[PDB]
Amino acid sequence: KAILLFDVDGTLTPPRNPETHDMKEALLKARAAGFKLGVVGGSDFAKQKEQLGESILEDFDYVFSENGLLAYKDGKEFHRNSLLRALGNEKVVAFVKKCLHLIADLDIPVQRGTFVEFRNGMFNVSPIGRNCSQQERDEFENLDKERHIREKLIRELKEAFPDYQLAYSVGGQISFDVFPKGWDKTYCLQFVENDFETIHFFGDKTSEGGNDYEIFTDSRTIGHSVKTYKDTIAILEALLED
């Protein structure tokens, strides 16, 4: 009894693009050989559907959106957790209020709008604020490297709220992510864990700091670092070669 899990963007696709019929057909052959297929991404269902196509649920045995907090199996939602339901309203307004003070008190040069973004399964926090232009993204991306503004706020928030059992991952250029210790991709394992001898995980951001790293290094997982989806298929075809 085996299952194959894939990150989405860059693993089953090019970097930011739709899937190939070469990929689909490689997956179909996987399934046809007796594997079950699952998918896991920090992305919300809408974006995953957008990259795998409308028939995503009919194509994979499991679909873990936002790293598993929204979960489908056999085309059937069977789990839904939220940031709000985990923490609760108080702890949430507390974290937010303090983010807003911290940020309001920075001596950085460019600040715009959308500094604290509350999302189903994570806080996204930006000192410059994500209502900023691409250019301003880069000016600031360079500032941060010199001053570690994201690093500091994280230290500050960590030590304001040790009881919150929260984890901090640095997002892209202007933003960092906060979520309860555990809500990386390994969240989803709790669900397939008990049903498969072997679990293959495919992903591309499996270096430390990456979002595949946790699940990849997990010992219940048989990890597979890939570069592009081209690799992914080779691995599949060899898996089925035998």
Pick out residues in 204-223 that bind Mg ion (CB under 5 A): 204-205
Candidate segments 36-44, 71-79, 128-136, 193-201, binder of a copy of itself by CB under 8 A: 128-136
Q: How many residues bind a copy of itself (CB under 8 A)?
A: 27
Nearer to Mg ion, 11 or 232 (CB): 11
Rounded Cα gap, residues 34 and 49, in angstroms: 24
Give yes or no for residue 143 binding a copy of itself (CB under 8 A). no
Rounded Cα gap, residues 147 and 140, in angstroms: 10
Nearer to Mg ion, 39 or 153 (CB): 39
In this structure, are residues 226 and 11 in contact, taking their beta carbons and an 8 Å threshold?
yes
| 85 alpha-carbon distance from chain centroid | 19
Centre a 10 Å sphere on the Cβ of residue 102 and count the other Cβ atoms it contains: 18
Candidate segments 48-56, 105-113, 179-187, 232-240, binder of a copy of itself by CB under 8 A: 105-113
Give yes or no for residue 129 binding a copy of itself (CB under 8 A). yes
7 binds, among Mg ion, a copy of itself, Cl ion, none (CB under 5 to 8 A by kind): Mg ion
Please report which residue ranges of the chain form alpha helices under DSSP H: 21-32, 45-52, 56-59, 83-87, 89-104, 134-147, 149-160, 189-192, 213-217, 229-241
Q: Any catalytic annotation for residue 9?
A: yes
User: Which of these, 99, 210, 95, 207, lies nearest to 152 by C-alpha position?
Assistant: 99
Q: Which of 21, 32, 46, 104 binds a copy of itself (CB under 8 A)?
A: 104
Q: Any catalytic annotation for residue 44?
A: no
Spell out, one character per residue from 40 to 79, where the chain touches a copy of itself: x when CB under 8 A holds, - when not: ----------------------------------------
DSSP state of 183: -
Pick out residues in 82-121 that bind Mg ion (CB under 5 A): none
**Which DSSP string corresponds to 11-58?**
TTSSSSSPPPHHHHHHHHHHHHTT-EEEEEESS-HHHHHHHH-TTHHH
Rounded least distance, CB 96 to Cl ion, Å:
8
In this structure, are residues 40 and 67 in contact, taking their beta carbons and an 8 Å threshold?
yes
Catalytic residue selected from 9, 59, 177, 184: 9
Rounded least distance, CB 86 to a copy of itself, Å:
14
Per CB under 5 A, residues contacting Cl ion are: 114-116
Per CB under 8 A, residues contacting a copy of itself are: 89, 92-93, 96-98, 100-101, 103-105, 109-119, 123-124, 129, 131-132
